[PDB]
Design a protein around this ligand. Structure first.
Ligand SMILES: Cc1cc2nc3c(=O)[nH]c(=O)nc-3n(C[C@H](O)[C@H](O)[C@H](O)COP(=O)(O)OP(=O)(O)OC[C@H]3O[C@@H](n4cnc5c(N)ncnc54)[C@H](O)[C@@H]3O)c2cc1C
Ligand SMILES: Cc1cc2nc3c(=O)[nH]c(=O)nc-3n(C[C@H](O)[C@H](O)[C@H](O)COP(=O)(O)OP(=O)(O)OC[C@H]3O[C@@H](n4cnc5c(N)ncnc54)[C@H](O)[C@@H]3O)c2cc1C
Lengths: 614, 614
C-alpha cells in the first residue's frame, strides 16, 4: 500500500536511504516518511550471503555456514567516525571480527606468465620485478607499492602550505590534498595519475607494473583524477587492521531495517519521475510498482521533502524524466546536469566460487598455505580473496593474530592446528576486479549456459534469492586462472557460484534482479568537489541528494553516511552523527569502538586460544 | 536564412548527410532539401588540413604544403564499391595517390621498454617476441599478426556451412561471418575477441602482445563482439595497397558541397528536437542557430521527410528531447532506445605534430630511414604515422614502388635521391590511438597551457580554423615517446600542432569547436545487426536514420554510404550507387577505378621516374 502523501519521501533503500530514515525517526521525530526501492531487496551495494552447507564429512543433519560478500566486505576503526558511531548506537560492535589481509608472505602473485609468492618477490632485493618488467634503474630494487608511497611523500614535500600532520588522515585531509596540492603548478585534481607518474619520469613498464600489482587499475587508466586516486591508494597500508561483521556487511542495513519497520519500506517500487505541485507546495512522485504476482501498477503520490539516496546514473535517469528538472531555466538545468558529470563511474564485479573444502592449503597444493588477503595477478582475475566457513575458534585465533603477541610453543601449536583446520571445511574464493578487467567477464557471464553443480540440492540447503549463478564459461576460465595463480594442477569444480557485475545499465531488456549501478565512483579530472558537494545537497527547494557517488569518502560506506549527514543538517538541523555521538558519550566513536573491540577480542582469545593471555 | 518548410530535412553535414542531398538532387530531382549542421564546418569525421609553410631553406615568398588528416586518411579500390563509384562520378580519380604502409622493414616497434625495427623483429625466428613476452610454446616463433590470421582460418574451418569463397570479402561476407559462424556452439557476435582467444588456449601474455602490436586495442578490450573485431583486423593484409587523395580525404566532401550548393547548407545550426504535426502530416524541427556575431537564435521549421545522418550519441540526444519519440508507446520507445545501444562507441584521437624538416631519416638518426606506415608501440602513442610535404616527384616514386617492377641501377639511383629528399622538406607525425590509450592524452590535452612555437606567424602562413593546438604537456610527452620509438636523442620542438579527440561529449560547458562524436563504432556483444540495420532505416514514418555508426562497414566511409543507400532505397526508390554505376557504365566501379588509376600511375611514372617503363 503506497501512501497518498508523506512528509519525507526517501528514494533508494541503500545505506543512505536507510540511514536517512533511521536518523529522521530517531532524532527528528519524523514518523511520516517512506522508503521506495526499485529492487526486491534492501542494502544496495552492501550484499552479504549466508550459505548453509550440508555437513557431509564422515563423522557428522548438522550445518556449516559460509559468509560471502557480493558488495562491500570491510571497514576500519579509524577514519570512519559516522560508521563507528552507527555501529555502537545499533549495538553491532559484538559481531565485529578480523578481516585479515595477508598470509605472512604466502599470498600469491601472478605476473607475465609467472606464479610466485609475496615472500618470493622480496628475495634478492625485489629482483623478480626487475626480471619481469623492463624497469629504469631508479625503479628497480624497491617494493612496487613503496613507489606509490614515495611519490605521495614527494607530493607532500613540494606542498608545504599543505598541513600534512593529522595522524588520522580523514576525508577533510584527502579533500584538501586533491584540491590544494599541485605538481608543476597544476593542482592534483587536474592531473590523472597516469599523466602524473609519466611526467615524474616513470617508465610505462613501471606504471603498468604498478596498476597490475595493485589489482585495481581504474586509479591509473580511468577518468578519475590523481588526487582522489591517492585517497584510495593510501587506504591500504601494510599495517592495516581491517574488520568486518561475522554475518557480513548486510548485518548493518538489516539492523537499520529492524529499527525502521518493514511497513515504511516499499520494495519493487521504482521512482520514475518527479514534479512539483506549485498549488500545495508539494513534490509529486511517479512510480512503477511490481506486485508479488508480477502485476505491474503505475501511480503517483506527494511529498513535502524528497531525499534522493541515489548514485550518478540513477540521478541522471530521474533528472531526464522529471518535470521538476525540466521546468528549470536552461542555464541552471544545464549546470545541474554538468555537475552530475563530475564523478566518474567505476565498474566493479565480484564472482564468488564456493567449494566443499578449500584446495589452496598446503595439504592440497604441496606449497606454502594461502590464508587471507588479496592474491594479485595481471590476469583478468585482478584480485582473489579467500573466505572460510564461520568458526568461532578461527575468529579468536585471528583476533589473537592481530595482536603483537608472541605465542609460546603450546599456544603456537594450537594456532597451527586452527590455521590448518579451516581448509577441511567449506570455503570460497572471490574474484574481485575493476575497470580494465570488467569486459572480460561480462561477455563471459552473458554467453552460453549458466553453471550448476549436479546435486546442488543435496549439498546446499536453500540458495538465497540475490544469488545469480556464474556462467559455465566464467567457471571454466576462473578455474584455469586459479591453477595459474595458486601454481597447482588441482582446482575442483565449485559447489555453488554467484556473479555480480556492478556496472550501470541503460537497457530496458534487463530483468529487475540483474540491474545494478556502478560499483563505486571517484571524482573526475577537473572536478572541484568542494563546490560540487555543496551544490548537490539541496539542488531544488526541499529535494535532496546524497550517497556515496558524490561524497567525501568515495568507495566506502562512510562516504554515503557523511553525504547523507549534509542533507540531515541542511534540511533538518541534525548535526553529524559522529559529533552527536561524542556529545552523548563524552568520547569519540573511534575511541569507543577500539575499547569495546579490545574487550570482545580479549575474551575471545582467553576463551579459545590462551587462557593466560596478556 | 532558415526556410519555413522543406521536402527533405537532412541533419548532419557529414558524409551521409552530404551524400544524401547529392543523390537526391541528382537522381530524384529533389531540389527542396536543406542540410543542418551544428558545427562550423562540413565533413564530420573527414577533416583534412593543408598547411602552407614558408619555404625557408637557403635557396628559395615561395610555399610548401603539408597535407594532414584529423580524421579519415585512406581507402581501398576493392570492397568499397559505393566510394569508388562516388569518386568516379565526381571526377576525383585523378587526385588519387598512394598511401604506403611500410618502409621495407625499417618501421619502428617499441614494446616493454625496447626499441627495434620490423626487420629486427623477424630475426632468429621472431625471437624478440619470445624474449619480450612470456609466451606458450605454440605462441613462439611466429609473426604475431599471423596468430590473428591463423585463428581466422580456424574459425572458417569449423564453419563449413559458411561459404568463405568470394575473393573480394565485402560487407555481406563480414556480416555473415559474424552472424553465422560459431565457436564452441556460440555464434561470433556473442563472443568477445578477448574471451575467444582465451577459450582457444592463448596466454594472457600472448593476448596482450596481440592488442599492443596491432596498435589498436578496442578490438580486444572493448564491448565490440569478436565477429566485427575480425572484420577490422582482416582489413590490413600485408599486401595492402591503400590510397588517399593528394589534398586529403576532405577533397570528397568539399566536392559534394560544390555540387549541392552552400545555400542549402546551414552551418552552426543544431537540431535540438523533433515533433510531428498530425494536422498537416509534417515533422517539426526545433533548432538553435549561432550567427557570425555569436548571436544565438532559436526557431522551428517543418519537413515532409527527415534524414538523420547521425551516429549513436547524437541520435540518443535527439531521441531523449523529441516529442516524436516520446509520444511513442512505451514498448516501442524502449525497444528503439535499446536498438540504439547495439553499436559500441569507439573513441579515437589524432595528434598531429608538424616539423620544418623530418628528423626520422637516416641523416638525422644514423639508423635505417623510417618512411611510411604505422610505427607501433605499447606506449600511449599506440601508432605513429609520418606525413610529408606534397611533392609530385615523391608521389610518382611511390606509384612506381607499388608496382612489382624491379628498377635498373639508374632508376634505383633516382628513387634513392627521391626517398632521401623528403626529409629535407616540412613533414609531420600523427599520433593515432584508440580505446585504452585515450584517457592518457585527454587529461594531458586539457591540462595547463596550450603549445605555441614562437614566431609561428613567421613560418606558417595561415592556420586553418579546424586546428586546435596540442597542450604543452601533450607535446612534452609525445616528444619523449618519439625518442623512445625512433631510438634517437634528437627530437626537436614542433612548428605547429593539432589535437583532435574523437570522444563523445555530454557536457554543456564545451565550446562548439571542441564537441566531437565518437571516432568510430562497432557492433556490440549480442547485436544481431541484420535486424538492427533494417530497424533503423525508417524508425518512424518518413523519418530516416543512416551513417557509419549502425552500418555494414563500420570504421569506414563506405559504411556511411551503404547505410545511406538503404534510406535512399526505402524512402525514395534509388538503387545502390554501385549498382547504378554499373548499369550506366557497363562495368563495376572497382574495375573502372583500377583502370583509371593505372593510367594516371603509368603517366606519373613515365613523367618523373623511368621514361622507358613497362
Ligand atoms: C564491490 C564493492 C565492494 C565494496 N566494498 C566496500 C568495503 O569493503 N567497505 C566499504 O565501506 N564500502 C564498500 N563498498 C561501498 C559501499 O557498498 C557503498 O559505498 C554504499 O553501500 C553505497 O550506498 P548508497 O546509499 O550511496 O548507494 P546504493 O547502495 O547504490 O543504494 C542506492 C539504492 O537506490 C536504489 N534505486 C536506484 N534508482 C532507484 C529508483 N529510481 N527508485 C528506487 N530505488 C532506486 C538501488 O536499487 C539501490 O538500492 C563497496 C562497493 C562495491 C560495489
Ligand atoms: C580518426 C578516424 C580515422 C578514420 N579513418 C578512416 C579511413 O582511413 N578511411 C575511411 O574510410 N574512414 C575512416 N574514418 C571513418 C569516417 O570518418 C566515417 O566513417 C565517416 O566520415 C562518418 O560519416 P557520418 O556521416 O556517418 O558521420 P559524421 O562524419 O560523424 O557526421 C555527423 C555530422 O552530424 C553533425 N551533427 C551531430 N548532431 C547534430 C545535430 N543535432 N544537428 C546538426 N548536426 C549535427 C556532426 O557535427 C557531424 O558533422 C575514420 C574516422 C576517424 C574518427
Amino acid at each position: 500500500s503506497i501512501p497518498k502523501e508523506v512528509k519525507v519521501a526517501i528514494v533508494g533503500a541503500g545505506m543512505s536511504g536507510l540511514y536517512s530514515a533511521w536518523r529522521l525517526q530517531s532524532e527528528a521525530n519524523v514518523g511520516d516518511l517512506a522508503i521506495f526501492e526499485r529492487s526486491d531487496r534492501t542494502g544496495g551495494r552492501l550484499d552479504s550471503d549466508l550459505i548453509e552447507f550440508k555437513d557431509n564429512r564422515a563423522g557428522a543433519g548438522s550445518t556449516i555456514t559460509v559468509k560471502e560478500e557480493q558488495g562491500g566486505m570491510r571497514f576500519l576503526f579509524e577514519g570512519m567516525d559516522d560508521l563507528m558511531a552507527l555501529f555502537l548506537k545499533l549495538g553491532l560492535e559484538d559481531q565485529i571480527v578480523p578481516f585479515p589481509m595477508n598470509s605472512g608472505g604466502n599470498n600469491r602473485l601472478y605476473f607475465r606468465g609467472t606464479s610466485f609468492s609475496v615472500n618470493d618477490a622480496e628475495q634478492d632485493d625485489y629482483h623478480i620485478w626487475s626480471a619481469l618488467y623492463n624497469l629504469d634503474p631508479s625503479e628497480q630494487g624497491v617494493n612496487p607499492k613503496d613507489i606509490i608511497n614515495v611519490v605521495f611523500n614527494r607530493i607532500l614535500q613540494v606542498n608545504p602550505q599543505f598541513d600534512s600532520r593529522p595522524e588520522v588522515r580523514g576525508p577533510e585531509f584527502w579533500q584538501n590534498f586533491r584540491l590544494q596540492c599541485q605538481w608543476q603548478g597544476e593542482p592534483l585534481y587536474n592531473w590523472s595519475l597516469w599523466d602524473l607518474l609519466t611526467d615524474m619520469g616513470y617508465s610505462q613498464e613501471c606504471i603498468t607494473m604498478l596498476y597490475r600489482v595493485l589489482g585495481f587499475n581504474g586509479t591509473f587508466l580511468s577518468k578519475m583524477n590523481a588526487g582522489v586516486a591517492y585517497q584510495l591508494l593510501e587506504d591500504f597500508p601494510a599495517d592495516v587492521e581491517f574488520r568486518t561483521f561475522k554475518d557480513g556487511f548486510s548485518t548493518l542495513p538489516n539492523a537499520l531495517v529492524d529499527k525502521i519497520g518493514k511497513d515504511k519500506i516499499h520494495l519493487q517500487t521504482s521512482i520514475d519521475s518527479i514534479a512539483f505541485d506549485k498549488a500545495d507546495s508539494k513534490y509529486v512522485l511517479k512510480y512503477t510498482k511490481i506486485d508479488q504476482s508480477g502485476q505491474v501498477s503505475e501511480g503517483k503520490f506527494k511529498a513535502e521533502k524528497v531525499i534522493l539516496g541515489l548514485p550518478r546514473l540513477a540521478l541522471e535517469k530521474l533528472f531526464i524524466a522529471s518535470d521538476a528538472f525540466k521546468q528549470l531555466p536552461k542555464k541552471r538545468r544545464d549546470e545541474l546536469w554538468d555537475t552530475l558529470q563530475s564523478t566518474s563511474n567505476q565498474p566493479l564485479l565480484k564472482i564468488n566460487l564456493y567449494y566443499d573444502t578449500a584446495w589452496w592449503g598446503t595439504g592440497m597444493t604441496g606449497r606454502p598455505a594461502v590464508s587471507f588477503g588479496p592474491n594479485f595477478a595481471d590476469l583478468p582475475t585482478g584480485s582473489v580473496y579467500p573466505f572460510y566457513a564461520l568458526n568461532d575458534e578461527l575468529a579468536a585465533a585471528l583476533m589473537y593474530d592481530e595482536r603483537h603477541a608472541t605465542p609460546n610453543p603450546d599456544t603456537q601449536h594450537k594456532l597451527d592446528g586452527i590455521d590448518a583446520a579451516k581448509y577441511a571445511r567449506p570455503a570460497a574464493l572471490t574474484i574481485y576486479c575493476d575497470y580494465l578487467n570488467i569486459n572480460f567477464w561480462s561477455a563471459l557471464q552473458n554467453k552460453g549456459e549458466l553453471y550448476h553443480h549436479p546435486h546442488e540440492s543435496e549439498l546446499v540447503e536453500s540458495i538465497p534469492s540475490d544469488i545469480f549463478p556464474a556462467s559455465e564459461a566464467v567457471v571454466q576460465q576462473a578455474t584455469q586462472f586459479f591453477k595459474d595463480i595458486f601454481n597447482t594442477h588441482y582446482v575442483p569444480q565449485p559447489t555453488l557460484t554467484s556473479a555480480r557485475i556492478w556496472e550501470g545499465n541503460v537497457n530496458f531488456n534487463v530483468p529487475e534482479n540483474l540491474q545494478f549501478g556502478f560499483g563505486v565512483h571517484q571524482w573526475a579530472i577537473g572536478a572541484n568537489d568542494k563546490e560540487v558537494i555543496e551544490d548537490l545537497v539541496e539542488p531544488l527547494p526541499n529535494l535532496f541528494t546524497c550517497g556515496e557517488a558524490y561524497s567525501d569518502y568515495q568507495g566506502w560506506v562512510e562516504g554515503a553516511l557523511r553525504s547523507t549527514d549534509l542533507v540531515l543538517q541542511k534540511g533538518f538541523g541534525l548535526a553529524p552523527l559522529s559529533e552527536v555521538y561524542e556529545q552523548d558519550q563524552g568520547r569519540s566513536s573511534s575511541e569507543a569502538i577500539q575499547i569495546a573491540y579490545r574487550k570482545i577480542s580479549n575474551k575471545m582469545i582467553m576463551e579459545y586460544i590462551d587462557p593466560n593471555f596478556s
